[PDB]
UniProtKB/TrEMBL annotation, chain A:
The lineage of its organism: Eukaryota, Metazoa, Ecdysozoa, Nematoda, Chromadorea. Belongs to the SPF27 family. It is found in: Nucleus. This is Pre-mRNA-splicing factor SPF27. Residues 23-57 form a coiled coil. The gene is bcas-2.
From TrEMBL, chain B:
It is found in: Nucleus. It comes from Caenorhabditis elegans. It comes from the Eukaryota. This is Pre-mRNA-splicing factor SYF1. The gene is syf-1. The chain holds residues 476 to 570 of 855 of the full protein. Belongs to the crooked-neck family.
TrEMBL record, chain D:
Involved in pre-mRNA splicing as component of the spliceosome. Component of the PRP19-CDC5L complex that forms an integral part of the spliceosome and is required for activating pre-mRNA splicing. As a component of the minor spliceosome, involved in the splicing of U12-type introns in pre-mRNAs. Identified in the spliceosome C complex. Component of the PRP19-CDC5L splicing complex composed of a core complex comprising a homotetramer of PRPF19, CDC5L, PLRG1 and BCAS2, and at least three less stably associated proteins CTNNBL1, CWC15 and HSPA8. Interacts (via its WD40 repeat domain) directly with CDC5L (via its C-terminal); the interaction is required for mRNA splicing but not for spliceosome assembly. Component of the minor spliceosome, which splices U12-type introns. Within this complex, interacts with CRIPT. Also interacts directly in the complex with BCAS2 and PRPF19. Coiled coil: none annotated. This is Pleiotropic regulator 1. Belongs to the WD repeat PRL1/PRL2 family. Signal peptide: none annotated. It comes from the Eukaryota.
Automatic annotation (TrEMBL), chain E:
This is Pre-mRNA-splicing factor Syf1/CRNKL1-like C-terminal HAT-repeats domain-containing protein. 1D-myo-inositol hexakisphosphate binds at K187, R191, A233, K234, K265, K267, R270. GO terms for biological process: mRNA splicing, via spliceosome. Belongs to the crooked-neck family. One of its GO terms (cellular component) is nucleus. Keywords: Coiled coil, mRNA processing, mRNA splicing, Nucleus, Repeat. The chain holds residues 187 to 465 of 744 of the full protein.
């Protein structure tokens, strides 16, 4: 019961800090995640064109 | 819309002088200073009003505030109009 | 490419590392920098064409990037950051307890103050009657 | 032994603060703040990018950068 | 310049003022090396009432010019803008910040505005501080121009004694003043310089109360006068009477004795005789 | 170049709206086929 | 002393001298006191948590959607890079077949 | 400067690069790889612990907490559930390699 | 060798000594202490991150290690709570002691004044 009182106390401090900064850092996280996805989609488009070129070179 | 009659109206040198006289009569010092200091901020005060303001503070014996009342007056006007403020400021300080 | 050059502030397509560097440079940046400066943009070490190595990605075996945010390293990291905080908190609590406990031990005059009052009042009870 | 004097002193102190016994032990303001300051440094250090986003709103739609 | 000002003024006649603001921001990019473009921009924001932009404009101007090459005409302009707002705590801060990095040359402008600023709000403690510190640097300018200006040293020493300045600083100022020995070596020029030593001995005796150091002031004085050409009988008299206040007649007689031995002069004989008559 | 005047001096009075300042028809054809 | 002093009978008492059933009452109420402080904290913690869950859930739902998209894209890139390398190696074998036929 | 390890796929606080490949690694992981195999993990060239260049720019900052991660026991719950997925993923790989 | 950190009272994998006191710390704690307090934690002298001198230097089961973390974390938090509880008790004992002292001064003041009456009866 003494130990749980501190876990809850640290939880309160964490939640109060989370309420200041989570809304931004989640937005910051999502921006980096969108950067990864658009870079990956750029790679997907580039390789799909490369695959279709090999078909064209073979057909030619 | 900023209709000119009320929009001008606070530039009221006759009325500011009447307001200041009532605060000397009934205001006590600290409210009277605020009224004159606002009259300076507006640039409504005449050099006579700066000298009246200082004489009020001098008659109360806030002599140091009188000197800055002159000083602030000197920032407000330019020559020739400052000349009577300098005359009164420099003699009053000197005594 | 996702690496951003530390000098130009824009994304690379030709990342380069050298043994005296640490921030990333572009190949098309550093070679002209060697020609004009000859000097490392950040550490000011001497630059030479044999130092530069160029980075690559997508080779065989390369692990997929974990994007889920949770990971074992990051959880062990923040649990470590919790522990550091709690020990530095406990240390300043233990320090304050030691100081408060110390001075109240020194302040234990109660029994000796009482004897002085007894000595004073017993004087008063004679002084009250010799008049 | 010191235990007797400690016991009597503690018992009187507890008894004087008897109406406070039901209250939880406090967290000192110094200790609460030093937890938060360490958390702001080591965990939420990404706030450096928050002011960069605020900086970007100043660099866009405003004045010249140094020369 | 005039092309941008005419384009700005054109948009102001339409009252486009945010488009006029765009012109200024581009104008400062090309031209902004000149301070006046920043001050005119901030004045444009102030007069329209954008005052948050005006603070930003000055603060960015300071950041633009830097930390070391402080463009202080910006800094005064920034200070006086905040004074006009009634931010006056900020206005002191800007002036006071400027005084540190600027300290000798450019402060001459800061102090004239800073002292006007304090002339209202300073009244007990702020006025006397800025005027004295203004006066202090103003006398130091006179000493850098001509260390032979004895009247500037006397007026400087008056200020520091009325300050009740820390003793070691007043000693450093007296000893700087004293080192300016007249180049002519004829007594007509020494008549003002000699009181630059007497005041030092009076300060050491009356204010510092370090009598063993006032001996050294007089010995240093008498080791500097060209006695075989002329003497100041005042020095020999004052040095003699000082040792009598130390109850050392043997020293006092030696002083007056070498006075007559080096330069027998009527003022010395009268003083020595009047002393021995009192004794 | 980071702090000095912006961070030293104090703050002014307000976070208001001037302190916020931050730089402050046709027809259409009917659709295909129809 | 901090182990020995527990309240009973509306006073502070030595725990060891009490009757056994009075020790049970004292320790029970001491337990319920601490569990009361936990419950006072837990209800406050749950309250702030519930606010954060709805406040942050939109940002989390965006991140969850991006993770599903990113997993799909990178597994497609994986298969495409496999297909590139076999068709390239197959294209070499077909070129030899041209010379043979 | 955000970097991720080629061995683990996680972020790294201490990125390092081999002189015989373009790929980047977390230092303690690649050193253990070198300590067992003496070779580059991706190009299979011979590699030694001194053939490493340190990408000593600022490492990747901590991920934000999940809302359930705001308490120490729920981090331990989260760490346990994370570990079970990592273990089963490793078990799925050796199954897939047999298949 | 086993080295014990003066801040935590626990073994450290990276023992460090501070020249401003000669006490041994975990590098990570003392850097965080310096980065917050700027001082030696034991001698209270000025300390900085360049002044630290470095000292020289199997698993069981993952559920077992996680259960050790659980039980150990409850022990660390029990320590943190009991410190706060003991700190307030120390403050309550102290304020009572000062109250006994100040009341004793009132008594000694009162009695010493009343003892003047016997000289003027
Ligand atoms: O030389 P003396 O006939 O004894 O005259 C002295 C002497 O004047 P000299 O300039 O001719 O020497 C003093 O001058 P100093 O040597 O001290 O410069 C002078 O003192 P002041 O210059 O301070 O006037 C003093 O006059 P006093 O006693 O009024 O100070 C005056 O004495 P007499 O009044 O006897 O002429």
């Amino acid at each position: 019961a003494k130990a749980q009182n501190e876990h809850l106390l640290m939880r309160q401090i964490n939640l109060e800090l989370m309420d200041e900064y989570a809304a931004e850092s989640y937005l910051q996280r999502n921006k980096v995640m969108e950067d990864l996805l658009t870079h990956a989609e750029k790679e997907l488009r580039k390789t799909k064109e490369a695959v279709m070129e090999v078909h064209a070179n073979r057909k030619m | 819309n900023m209709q000119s009659v009320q929009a001008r109206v606070h530039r009221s040198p006759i009325l500011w002088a009447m307001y200041a006289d009532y605060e000397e009569c009934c205001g006590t010092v600290e409210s009277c200073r605020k009224v004159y200091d606002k009259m300076i901020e507006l640039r409504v005060a005449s050099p006579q009003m700066i000298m009246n303001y200082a004489m009020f503070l001098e008659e109360n014996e806030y002599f140091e505030l009188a000197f800055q009342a002159y000083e602030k007056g000197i920032a407000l006007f330019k020559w020739p109009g400052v000349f009577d403020i300098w005359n009164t400021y420099l003699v009053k300080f000197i005594k | 490419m996702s690496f951003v050059c530390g000098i130009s502030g824009e994304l690379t397509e030709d990342p380069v590392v050298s043994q005296v560097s640490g921030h990333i440079f572009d190949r098309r940046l550093i070679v002209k920098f060697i020609a004009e400066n000859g000097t490392d943009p950040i550490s000011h070490g001497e630059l030479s064409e044999d130092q530069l190595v160029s980075l690559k990605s997508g080779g065989t075996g390369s692990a997929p990037r974990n994007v889920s945010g949770t990971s074992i390293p990051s959880l062990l990291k923040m649990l470590q950051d919790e522990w550091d905080t709690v020990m530095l908190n406990s240390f300043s609590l233990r320090q304050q307890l030691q100081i408060a406990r110390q001075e109240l031990s020194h302040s234990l005059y109660q029994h000796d103050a009482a004897c002085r009052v007894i000595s004073r009042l017993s004087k008063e009870l004679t002084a009250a009657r010799e008049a | 032994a010191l235990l007797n004097q400690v016991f009597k002193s503690l018992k009187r102190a507890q008894d004087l603060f008897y109406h406070d016994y039901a209250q939880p032990p406090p967290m000192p303001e110094e200790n609460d703040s030093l937890i938060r300051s360490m958390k702001r440094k080591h965990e939420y250090g990404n706030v450096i990018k928050k002011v960069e986003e605020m900086k970007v709103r100043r660099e866009n739609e405003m004045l010249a950068l140094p020369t | 310049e005039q092309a941008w000002q005419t384009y700005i003024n054109f948009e102001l006649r339409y009252k486009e003022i945010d488009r006029a603001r765009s012109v200024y921001q581009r104008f400062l990019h090309v031209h902004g090396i000149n301070v006046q473009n920043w001050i005119k921009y901030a004045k444009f924001e102030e007069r329209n009432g954008y005052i948050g932009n005006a603070r930003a404009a000055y603060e960015k101007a300071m950041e633009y010019f830097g930390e070391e090459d402080i463009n202080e005409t910006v800094l005064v302009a920034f200070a006086l803008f905040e004074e006009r707002q009634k931010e006056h705590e900020r206005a002191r801060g800007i002036f006071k910040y400027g005084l540190d990095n600027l300290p000798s040359n450019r402060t001459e402008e800061i102090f004239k505005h800073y002292t006007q600023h304090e002339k209202k709000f300073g009244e007990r403690v702020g006025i006397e501080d800025v005027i004295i510190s203004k006066r202090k640097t103003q006398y130091e300018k006179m000493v850098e121009e001509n260390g032979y200006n004895y009247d500037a040293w006397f007026d400087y020493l008056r200020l520091l004694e009325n300050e009740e300045t820390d003793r070691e600083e007043v000693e450093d100022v007296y000893e700087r003043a004293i080192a300016n020995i007249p180049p002519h070596s004829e007594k007509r020029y020494w008549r003002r310089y000699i009181y630059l030593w007497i005041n030092y001995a009076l300060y050491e005796e009356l204010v510092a109360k370090d009598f063993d150091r006032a001996r050294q002031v007089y010995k240093a004085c008498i080791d500097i006068i060209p006695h075989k050409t002329f003497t100041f009988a005042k020095v020999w008299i004052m040095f003699a009477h000082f040792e009598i206040r130390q109850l050392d007649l043997n020293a006092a007689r030696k002083i007056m004795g070498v006075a007559i031995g080096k330069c027998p002069k009527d003022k010395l004989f009268r003083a020595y005789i009047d002393l021995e008559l009192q004794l | 170049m980071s702090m000095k005047l912006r961070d030293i001096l104090p703050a002014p009075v307000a976070a208001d709206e001037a302190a916020s300042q931050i730089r402050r028809v046709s027809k259409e054809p009917p659709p295909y086929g129809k | 002393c901090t182990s020995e002093i527990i309240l009973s009978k509306d006073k502070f008492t030595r725990i060891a001298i009490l009757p056994r059933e009075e020790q049970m009452k004292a320790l029970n109420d001491e337990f319920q006191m601490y569990r009361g402080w936990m419950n006072q904290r837990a209800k406050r913690a749950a309250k702030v948590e519930k606010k954060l869950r709805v406040k942050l859930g939109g940002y989390q739902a965006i991140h969850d959607k991006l993770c599903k998209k990113y997993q799909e894209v990178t597994t497609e890139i994986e298969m495409a890079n496999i297909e590139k390398k076999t068709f390239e190696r197959l294209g070499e074998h077909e070129l030899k077949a041209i010379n043979k036929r």
